């Protein structure tokens, strides 16, 4: 749902979405790390779970749309910086 912006999710959001209690969110994520659906870690000094999602799947055309807009941003940022490098270092290009 969140495209790796702030992937460090706290206990309240899992307890609300999965309707599970706070005393079971730690046992829930160790089972998920045991299977291999994710390879994150668990911090409890802020009660927040770090998440490095490594198990992909299918998605729809609605996530395809924002994927292209991020790709179009990915396209126009790299091409703009090549134009800054090609203009700046043209005299030493040879």
């Amino acid at each position: 749902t969140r495209p790796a912006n702030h992937r460090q999710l706290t206990f309240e959001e899992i307890a609300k979405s999965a309707k599970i209690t706070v005393n079971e969110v730690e046992l829930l994520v160790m089972k998920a790390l045991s299977v291999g659906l994710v390879k994150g870690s668990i911090d409890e000094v802020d009660k927040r779970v770090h998440m490095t999602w490594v198990q992909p799947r299918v998605l729809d055309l609605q996530q395809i749309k924002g994927m292209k807009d991020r790709l179009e941003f990915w396209c126009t940022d790299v091409k703009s910086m090549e134009m800054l490098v090609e203009h700046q270092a043209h005299d030493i290009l040879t």
Binding site: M81, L84, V85, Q88, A89, D91, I92
Partner: protein
């Protein structure tokens, strides 16, 4: 000062508005200009040629 600016006298207490922002995170603005500074070194380690 109350009609021009704030400093509203309420229950014997003034209220001066105040906030702060936060910016240590931007390595991106010393990314572009540092890349300019490194190339203009190497532009000038040669070129009196």
């Amino acid at each position: 000062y109350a009609k021009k600016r704030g400093w509203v006298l309420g229950p014997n207490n003034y209220y001066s508005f105040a906030s702060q922002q936060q910016k240590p995170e931007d390595t991106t603005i010393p990314s572009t200009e540092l890349a300019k500074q490194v190339i203009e070194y190497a532009r000038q380690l040669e070129m009196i040629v």
